[PDB]
Design a protein around this ligand. Structure first.
Ligand SMILES: CC(=O)Nc1cccc(CN)c1
Ligand SMILES: CC(=O)Nc1cccc(CN)c1
Ligand SMILES: [Ca+2]
Ligand SMILES: [Ca+2]
Ligand SMILES: [Mg+2]
Ligand SMILES: [Mg+2]
Lengths: 232, 9, 232, 9
């Protein structure tokens, strides 16, 4: 890696500067270099890793959807191979970013994560990046969907045993697993059931929270409510 | 149209 | 070049798709490949070249300014070399994009531009990318500023001889030369005089325009007026 | 604070 020669602490410092500068490709490269030092990540460092890669793949996914829409419209005047070629280029780069994140999780972030807050976060990330692979998959599509489901399910099982129903990681996991069920697995009723149960169990535990914890949990509950409004 | 997944800050 | 094997028309098509997808680095690479085919660019192709590189350097300049602000604040608790290193990294990449655009103009877009509308557009671009070099220059700073001034001046001299005062290229040239004078050359009075004369001479020629030409010219005149409001 | 240069579309 091009970051091998940089101190861990300097890569984390530069990841925070790259986030201020909205330089997300740089931020991801810094955080990849930090993970490759081989030490476990703190909570704040896990959040830097996730912000960096979510912003990089977010741009790729948005671009892929614009190009896939143009391609679908072309296939309903012949304009040649260029729309397909360029959608394929962006797709291959998106797949490559997803494979990079999956490879960091498999070598060796998940296996060295023993605390529920790290293990659930990494397994959610594994589900999310398989989900992004599944969004573009047409060929192993079933096995990619099962890989997303399996990671989300293991994260869910640990989260329900080890975390309160208001824990923001547990909430964001359930939110993203419900999107998986609705958009990827063609299970809208599973999506709606999981969002409603998650919202209701969280609402009944808000009384236990500080004002700051309450704000963190209710922000994510509002996303569950927004999806249930969209879906019902 | 598309649902909200976790929005990361 | 990695675009050597792609047809000119396919590079232009993909530049337009990259613009729809907000993939500006790709759009710039496509348009660099198109310029390197060696044929002159049409009006619409010149606009694709300028949109692509303005968006790429625009992100770099915004990032550089955030990092330069943090660095200046650091130099007023010691946090090590990392802010300077990362500002230098972004600076070097910005300089590299500016050198790439300047190299396209010098090899061979300007010398094969004989029409006023192409020649003025390329010379304005030459001034703009020297201006972006001058924004980060501390070491040849004077020679970079003179290079920007010389390109803008030659574009101005051709524009005043060959184009009406409402021509959008002539207006945008004068707008950017006034920003050069205000922000780079420490000549705020030259900036204000050029913006006022440009605005007034354009206003007196609006009567000659179609509704669509009127809309194009007045949009740019509003930017001149916004700067004169800021400056006076 | 910063002035407007040509905004490219
Ligand atoms: C940066 C980041 O990923 N934050 C975050 C916040 C709340 C929840 C989750 C996922 N359960 C993630
Ligand atoms: C894409 C682009 O550069 N457009 C544009 C429009 C109006 C004026 C100018 C420069 N005089 C440029
Ligand atoms: Ca070390
Ligand atoms: Ca050819
Ligand atoms: Mg039903
Ligand atoms: Mg005065």
């Amino acid at each position: 890696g091009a970051m091998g020669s940089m101190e861990r602490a300097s890569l984390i410092q530069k990841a925070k500067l790259a986030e201020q500068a909205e330089r997300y490709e740089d931020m991801a490269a810094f955080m990849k270099g930090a993970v490759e030092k081989g030490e476990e990540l703190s909570c704040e460092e896990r959040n830097l890793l996730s912000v960096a890669y979510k912003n990089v793949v977010g741009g790729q996914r948005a671009a892929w959807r614009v190009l896939s829409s143009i391609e679908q419209k072309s296939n309903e005047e012949e304009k040649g191979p260029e729309v397909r070629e360029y959608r394929e280029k962006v797709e291959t780069e998106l797949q490559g970013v997803c494979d990079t994140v999956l490879g960091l999780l498999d070598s060796h972030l998940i296996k060295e994560a023993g605390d529920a807050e790290s293990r659930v976060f990494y397994l959610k990330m594994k589900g999310d990046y398989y989900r992004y692979l599944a969004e573009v998959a047409t060929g192993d599509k079933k096995r990619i969907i099962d890989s997303a489901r399996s990671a989300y399910q293991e994260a869910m099982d640990i989260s329900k045993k080890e975390m309160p129903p208001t824990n923001p990681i547990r909430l964001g996991l359930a939110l993203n697993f419900s999107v998986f069920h609705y958009e990827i697995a063609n299970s809208p009723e599973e999506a709606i059931s999981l969002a409603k149960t998650t919202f209701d169990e969280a609402m009944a535990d808000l009384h236990t929270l500080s004002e700051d914890s309450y704000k963190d949990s209710t922000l994510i509950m509002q996303l569950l409510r927004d999806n249930l409004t969209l879906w019902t | 149209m598309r649902p909200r997944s976790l929005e990361v800050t």
